[PDB]
DNA sequence: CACAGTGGTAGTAGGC
DNA sequence: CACAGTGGTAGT
DNA sequence: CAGGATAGGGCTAC
DNA sequence: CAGGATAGGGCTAC
DNA sequence: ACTACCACTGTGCGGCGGTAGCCCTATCCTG
DNA sequence: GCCTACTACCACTGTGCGCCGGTAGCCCTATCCTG
């Protein structure tokens, strides 16, 4: 057997993306041509993953979770969760298939294991500890579209799917004197650690759907919040407390499951308490107040009206919390989503000052697509921008370049309107950095010192010179880049950390493995899909796959 | 029989299977809508007004002395003494039920519109679990009324509930719980006539007495074809319960029950088997002590209908049935479902 | 070293394998058993040069017309020399094509294993240097929905047209005897359908798709004038080439054989018939259109020696009013059909549960309505999802008895229950026809009885189903009744002769251009090209087949 | 100098770089339809019809006597004196030149709708060659008319041709060919003054003498500011032919002329190099024997234009312009031209 | 009748 | 400042 | 007042 | 005649 | 044989029947 | 009787048709009733 261990294998034909079937192609292939099992076949890669899956490593609860099984060798569970898929309740358009999130969790953990000891041992610290450590997991569901429902038995699922996945984004165990961080991932938007949890095929808008789906999630989160993992690794009986971050949600997430009302709201942050109108005023100076314990005391009131009030006065007494939140989300950015929104609001921008609106506030429908149509040839001239119909992130971050502002000006016969916009983009790639750093302590800590007042003359720019399309009407996401980042970096030290873009670069291999690595049978795609994209994410098989360095 | 499509423009993505209709007075209030209360009806609650078979759900509002409640599926609504519908259980859109009494009445009626004062009643005593497809249904005896709340599933108990199954239901224990909105006191009156959990079972609510009639027990996951009588005697102190397995009820679930005339309902739509439906309507002849669930004549079911794998509804309130079937997901956002209106 | 390059390289591309995966792979298996068991990237690489074109040397006894005589051109640029200057004609698009000299020398001396094999399967030699009728099965499809990409290049659509080239069969003359050396067995198999040109145009563009398939065209006809001296196993073999253009979808066809477009009531690429005269006759229909008589028909529409109206010159030419630019055969797309015919059907039961046999007037919100119920019916009795665009398993899963017995589910009147099954019948004992490899062997009984089940279906159609087939016939339910006996006289087959394999290439295409190509205007047709055609090389895939 | 943004809202993907517009009984035509004729217009003619800054593409019947013409792109298109168009060379939709002079008179006219008679012309003798972006511009000389033909792109010869290089285009050689309509007998003329092969050339005649201004000459790749007088010989017998390359020629290619009064034309601009297209008018007066290239007041031109790569259009014929530039939203069904028209006093 | 997967069972060849 | 490719070429 | 354009929709293919 | 619904569009996020 | 570089990708939104063409007929639109 | 390899088998996938700004929601205002 001078070949391979069947988790390489496993780790091969995951991080190649290899399907089970290419993959038995090329063990056949090599076995009939060398003649020897380099490569180990099927089943012995399935016994691998069965390690690699949650429900093989025993662990316990110090004290036992809440209304979680103390089975550890649940894996793949229906997300349904015992949903009645009956006629007489309500309708089940839903394939979800989860982990448990403990029983993820714990197979994250021991997948990390030699990582949290190589930390243990670079920190100074003892590998055979078994000292409570401290897991901060970034918990991160985000809605997928064109997820094309197949045909055969099954729900009449639609067309779209919710990923939840956590990612374990640092460990860190209290050597008495203070929480050293024994790991950190460092790249936490990436897509080998994002681990799926949850994958629904289901809109992550129904409320009804996903909350039947998330709330095994929510409880086994509520559970383990109050609960120390004794999980055994290295050979030691370790500990583990986590702190679950929920961050990795987009803003229409985040309101649908804080009980928020529409990113069109009025009340504009999922941080702080403040309106869209304070927040074309003010802009910065916004604390951040919005928890979800606070968005359930709200909820609460709403519901209750205890002080009696007209649906305005109580919607502005609970801040726009409207609908009960399941998801205690943490107040934050996604990186991702601020980045693609701030890019959006910079493109129609971009727009306006072609359309000089700041002298012509009146404009053509007509005329505000043809100045769409005219940065887009130029930005496909200039930048080499295609014209895309849903702005994305690398669009973006394209666009958000002192380059495509060059470009832009070509289109603004207005000096002035030129320097506005180079300030303003000047502003907005000091600030960037920041809330897109995983972490900019270090990574950009020069802007992060000037956070505040990079943002301070950015709201002022948008009030002096793009006084238009900035009064009384500030995007969701400007608020949150401008008033509230240095205080999420105070509270968590990053943003772009704590994004949905490892979520979302993950929807790419939902679909790249509910096509070539999984079943395509709605009873058995999300199974699989969650099956690989856990592998995907494992450590283990990582490192295996990083031998060429190790 | 009188069955004739409805067109719904905005808003239809708001009905979906547990919705609750209200009648008020003559006029028809949708409550339990998909997803939250949005910002366009923060209250939750509609006017359900047809029109040229075309149903406008324009947003209703709540009063003051108002909770502004959940959008609740499968509760248990009952029209009540003034007319506050009682909306007990239900699956908020978070999938959790609701304990909490919802007294939906109708405070102001000087615009064109209406203005609920849906009241948060807190329940005492042997208060029922949290629940949906149960029924509440006021009996009026000697004078005093009671809510007769009976059945329902209802997710595992906090100890039993487990995350595997975190949404499990099981068919609450079959007792009829006797409520006093006057005092928000229910009364558990565990009766041996009901062995049996029951859950989308309609009921007929009729002076002293509540007609339990083909519900769906999920421990057997059979629709039995039974019609319990609980009649409530209501001697100062605590009240008199006591049931009576009559014969004659249909096998039948998530069924619309509909006064089409006095001591007469008909009982459309429902489930005789999870993978049939009912088609047949049932008329149900009613005395102070009679019951005859005479099976009415077969509406002219539409295929739009007949070979839908569900449907569900509500009572208009007029002796009318309202009644929405999955309609094509061709595209995603294409039309939630086909609904009907069927006049009796 | 147990492995070979060409082996790796074969497990990469027939595994889909990414060079950037397969490098991860590689350095791994290196790291963990030490052995450089994977050959490393740059020797897949070299090993690529054997099989891409420009590699093996050859010859045309008659050298080419207008062809350049290098053995050494691979993956040049589909433009051709197109002027890019503004003055010019923009070119909104990246064309990457292989020279068909060099594709199909590469092609056959990727069979020549295969070549060998068959012919020394077939009775034959090696010392047999003899004029091999090598087949080719020309396929050019447009894909559509191509996501294009940022960065340098011109502002090309958001399309494709997929140029390809299956070998069908190579057949070698033996004293009077024409011996089938090698048939594709699995003949619209993506393995097969050897691509030619990507390029990241629009086939409804006739101008960029013409200058960038004339040099292709070009190319094809000078080697249907000459003979290819390729030296298989040592010995120097004379290929003859016999292009059938037949992967072509009928809107191809008719933007390159000169046709109006299908909704023309000219409604035949095979015969110069009518819409309404093959919604009467609808069987007997000599195939008569052909890429020469289509020429001649064009330059007398251009001409209009008979000084004709615009009207009597179109029935003169019967719809050549273009200039046919593709030597297209007169045939059917197997899989076009099978997607026409089963959209038709679908309509048909769309009408049925509309009973328009009895009400002709109905609104279209009611045939909206009747959609929707055979939508919902078809989910639930077949299982299978309601689809915008009609593919071909939905005309699998929906030719079916089976479906035809869930939709009568859906209509009241039996009678129409029995035209339906006996339509789905007649077309069930047609369809293995067309849509069989070799019917003759797959399904001769349907065969030798397609002209009486195609009478049958043709009177059922216009009998029971006058509603929707009087005067105005699908022109791939006239193709089926009409043209599939002679096709299959002169063809020996039809679903060997579909875009199907071409089309199923569009899915490695995207495949590669997302996963096994430079994400880059610049490189993405040149590296996808280079990759679908390993991917389609019997070299590599042998390689894959050892274990059998 | 007047411009005006033109609607275009059917048919408006058959217009295509290549086009040419015609000028019939003062009522404008367009030829050259992208891709070939469709069953909407089986001619490839349409009356060109702005009102009100809107196109309208309707359809053109040709003659029973007609030659139903391809949709050529970059031919050369002359007048004349009922008032027959004279198209000769362009690139078929096939991307395959024609050889083929296309003579499109007016067969006659009713309801604004006009039959024409897109008669052939076979050219004996020294037909010059398959190509395009050429210039034909007929002369009068002693009365009698002839047909000046200057070289434009052509694909290499068949023995010189390669698939590899299948479209690749090489300028004409630099000849005159003097077309006699009343017999198709074309003749070369090798001036040795017109020994760089040109193209895309605007090409103005007056009389007697044809003024080639600006083109490309893609033997030098570049755009020769050169004013080539061809003049031009009818006499009883000998026709004579005699190049002089004039001063003041301008550096342009592609470039759109319009006699927007009686020897006063105006050459909106082409290109000036492939990416630098000459947004400044020129306008050209032109004594019996004499030519003034002038530079008008350039048009206000929109952004559209002036940040576009590049721009095509042609004579509507009275002293319009219309021009084309790609509107590229999404070039793919909506409008893939975002189309002008410019008028001149 | 397209075809090459999609991968996890299940059953069946082998070993021992 | 996402990140893991995408593959050939150039450069160690 | 009827002839011609013409917009729209049904129909064919993709 | 002004109050209320309401349709539409601009705006926020996806 | 490694690795960097280039100059970008997809995942990040969703929906919905669409084009193009053709051909016939219900508007419309004249004069 | 253990394990190991191999392969059928399930019932389906995508590639086959494009096209475009969209939905959901919010909320604020021009329409539009509403007698
Ligand atoms: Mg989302
Ligand atoms: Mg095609
Ligand atoms: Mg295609
Ligand atoms: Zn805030
Ligand atoms: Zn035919």
Redesign the pocket.
């Known amino acids: 057997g001078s070949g391979l261990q069947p988790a390489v294998c496993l780790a091969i034909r995951v ?3 290899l ?7 090329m ?2 292939t090599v ?2 041509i060398t003649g020897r ?1 380099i490569f ?8 691998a ?1 069965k390690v690699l899956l949650p429900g093989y490593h025993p662990f316990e609860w110090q004290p036992p979770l809440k209304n979680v099984s103390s089975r550890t060798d649940v894996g793949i569970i229906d997300g349904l969760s015992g949903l009645a898929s009956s006629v007489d309740e309500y309708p089940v358009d839903t394939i979800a298939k989860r982990f448990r999130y403990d029983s993820a969790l714990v197979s994250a953990l021991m997948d990390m294991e030699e990582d949290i000891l190589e930390g243990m041992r670079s920190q100074d610290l003892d590998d055979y500890l078994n000292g409570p450590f401290t897991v901060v997991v970034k918990e991160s569901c ?5 997820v ?1 429902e ?4 099954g729900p009449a699922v ?3 799917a919710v990923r939840f996945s956590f990612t374990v984004m640092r460990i860190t165990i209290e050597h008495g004197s203070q929480n050293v961080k024994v790991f950190e991932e ?8 994002c681990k799926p949890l949850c994958l629904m095929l289901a ?3 129904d409320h009804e759907t996903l909350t039947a789906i998330l709330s095994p999630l929510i409880a086994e989160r509520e559970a383990m919040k109050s609960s120390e993992l004794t999980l055994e690794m290295g050979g030691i009986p370790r500990t583990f407390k986590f702190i679950f971050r929920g961050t990795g949600y ?5 309101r649908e499951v804080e009980g928020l ?8 942050c999922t941080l702080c308490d403040t309106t ?1 109108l304070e927040a074309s005023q003010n802009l910065v100076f916004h604390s951040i107040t919005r928890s979800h314990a606070e968005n359930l005391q709200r909820y609460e009131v709403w519901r209750s009206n205890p002080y009696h009030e007209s649906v305005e006065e109580l ?1 502005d007494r609970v801040k726009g919390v ?1 609908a009960k939140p399941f998801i205690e989300t943490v107040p934050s950015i ?9 890019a ?2 910079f493109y ?1 921008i971009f727009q306006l000052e072609i359309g000089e609106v700041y002298k012509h506030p009146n404009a053509s ?1 007509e005329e ?1 697509k043809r100045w769409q149509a005219t940065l887009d040839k130029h930005l496909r001239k200039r930048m ?1 921008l ?1 014209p895309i ?10 666009l958000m370049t002192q380059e495509t502002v060059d470009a832009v000006c070509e289109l603004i016969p207005s000096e002035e309107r030129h320097e506005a916009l180079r300030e303003l983009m000047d502003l907005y ?1 000091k600030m ?2 920041v809330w ?5 302590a270090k ?2 800590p020069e ?1 992060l010192c000037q956070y505040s007042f990079n943002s301070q003359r950015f709201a002022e720019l948008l009030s002096t010179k793009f006084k238009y ?2 009064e009384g ?6 608020h949150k880049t401008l008033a509230h980042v240095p205080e999420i970096i105070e509270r968590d030290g990053s943003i ?1 950390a704590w ?4 979520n ?2 993950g ?2 291999l939902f ?2 493995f509910r ?7 709605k009873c ?1 795609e999300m ?2 899909v969650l ?2 994209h856990w592998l995907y994410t494992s450590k283990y098989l990582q490192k295996f ?1 990083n031998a ?2 190790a | 029989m009188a069955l004739q499509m409805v067109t719904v ?2 808003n239809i ?2 009905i979906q299977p547990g919705f609750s209709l209200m009648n008020f007075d003559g006029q028809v209030f949708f409550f339990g809508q ?2 939250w ?4 009806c ?1 209250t939750g609650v509609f006017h359900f007004d047809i029109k040229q078979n075309h149903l ?1 759900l ?1 947003p209703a509002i709540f009063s003051k002395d108002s909770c502004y409640l959940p959008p609740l599926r499968y509760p248990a609504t009952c029209s009540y003494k003034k007319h506050q519908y009682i909306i007990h259980g239900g699956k908020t859109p978070n999938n959790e039920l609701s304990d909490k009494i919802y007294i939906m009445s109708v405070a102001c009626k000087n ?3 209406v203005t609920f004062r849906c009241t948060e009643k807190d329940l005492v005593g042997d208060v029922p679990e949290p629940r949906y497809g149960h029924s509440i249904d006021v009996v009026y005896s000697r004078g005093k009324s009671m809510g007769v709340l009976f059945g329902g599933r209802s997710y595992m108990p906090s100890t039993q509930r487990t995350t595997e199954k975190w949404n499990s239901v099981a068919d609450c224990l079959p007792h009829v719980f006797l409520i006093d909105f006057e005092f928000g006191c229910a009364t558990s009156y565990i009766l041996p006539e009901l062995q049996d959990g029951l859950s989308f079972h309609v009921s007929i609510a009729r002076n002293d007495t509540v007609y339990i009639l083909g519900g769906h027990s999920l421990a057997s996951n059979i629709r039995p074809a039974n019609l319990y009588r609980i009649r409530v005697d209501l001697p100062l102190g605590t009240p008199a319960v006591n049931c009576t397995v009559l014969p004659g009820g249909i096998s039948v679930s998530s069924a619309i029950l509909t006064q089409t005339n006095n001591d007469e309902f008909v009982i459309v739509g429902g489930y005789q088997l999870e993978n049939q439906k009912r088609m047949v309507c049932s008329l149900v002849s009613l005395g102070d002590n009679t019951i005859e669930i005479s099976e009415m004549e077969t509406p002219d079911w539409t295929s739009d209908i007949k070979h839908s794998k569900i449907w569900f509804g509500s009572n208009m309130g007029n002796g009318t049935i309202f009644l929405g079937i999955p309609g094509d997901n ?5 039309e939630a479902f086909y609904f009907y209106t069927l006049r009796c």
């Not at chain 1, 399907?19 to 192609?25: F, N, P, R, V």
């Not at chain 2, 209360?37 to 366009?40: D, V």
């Open positions: 991080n190649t993306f399907s089970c079937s290419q993959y038995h192609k063990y056949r076995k009939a099992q180990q076949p099927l089943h012995a890669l399935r016994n993953e985000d809605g997928m579209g064109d094309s197949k045909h055969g038995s639609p067309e779209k460092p790249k936490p938007n990436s897509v080998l650690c809109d992550e808008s987009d803003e229409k997430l985040v009302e529409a990113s069109g709201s009025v009340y504009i869209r919607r409207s996604d990186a991702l989503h601020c980045d693609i929104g701030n959006a609001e129609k429908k505000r080499n295609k119909m849903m702005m994305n992130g690398n669009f973006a971050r394209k790639l960037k950095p897109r750093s995983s972490c900019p990574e950009c802007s399309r900035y009407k500030i995007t969701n996401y400007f772009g994004a949905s873009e490892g979302e670069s929807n790419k679909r790249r096509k070539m690595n999984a079943r395509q049978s058995y199974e699989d099956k690989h796959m060429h360095n | 423009g905005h993505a708001l998909k997803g209360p949005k910002r366009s923060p406008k324009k615009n064109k519109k061709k595209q995603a956002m294409s």
